[PDB]
């Protein structure tokens, strides 16, 4: 031993819980979700009209 640290995290030097005055930080990366495969866009007929209801 031969040393007595201050521990910098205890409050009032009493009890356990030596990580009470430390904060949590932003890692830097956001997870989000996966993109499902979409195959029906092709394999069918696509047309386009400039006016009209049908």
């Amino acid at each position: 031993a031969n040393f007595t640290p201050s521990r910098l995290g205890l409050v009032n030097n009493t009890g356990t819980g030596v990580k009470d005055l430390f904060l949590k930080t932003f890692a830097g990366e956001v997870l989000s979700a996966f993109r499902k495969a979409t195959i029906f866009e092709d394999l069918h007929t696509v047309r386009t009209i400039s006016s009209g209801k049908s």
Binding site: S32, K36, L43, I49
Partner: protein, 218 residues
Amino acid sequence: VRSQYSVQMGNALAYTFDQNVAAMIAQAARTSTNPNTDLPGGTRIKILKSGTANTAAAVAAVTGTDLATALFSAAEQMDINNLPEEDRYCAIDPTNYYKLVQNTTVINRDFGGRGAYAEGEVLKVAGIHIVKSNHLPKTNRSAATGENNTYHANYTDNIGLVFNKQAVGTVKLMDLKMEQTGADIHALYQGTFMVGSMMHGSGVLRPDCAIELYAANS
């Protein structure tokens, strides 16, 4: 957060379009009579299972041999209606796909090959390309506001679709668009608003180029 919301909205629109297209293909498969009286109509193939009442136990009991026989019957039906021998497709879900792959006959290079046990894939059976999709119609559907075409039916016993490129068509009027408001909306409502919208419609063209595979009892 404004970089992820745009991706999520675009993905949601694409997923909705895919689900609608698949539902329309199934509906074309279920059409008994062609709009033109002379031409033939759609046809469904039934996998008999047991004497049980109509339940999902029949869907859960399907084996790979039944799937192979159903695919061959579908190819026969496609050839009866004088369809071309190119661009035939089959859409199946991962459970049935991997029940089919483990059937070693379809990947045997000694007969016809076109598969790989190591890669865990099958590519072609009876001349029909095989693909996987998670957006097949597998529930019952109810009519919703804003739908001018009939998308609703009961798809509880669906297994897969065998179709062509000419079975279903779509019409587009307005393309995709992304908009965001920040000039005066910010002061009235302390915030920001983002939109994404598009307009189109889908329908059934040729009922005779679509086939439905379903599992039920007597």
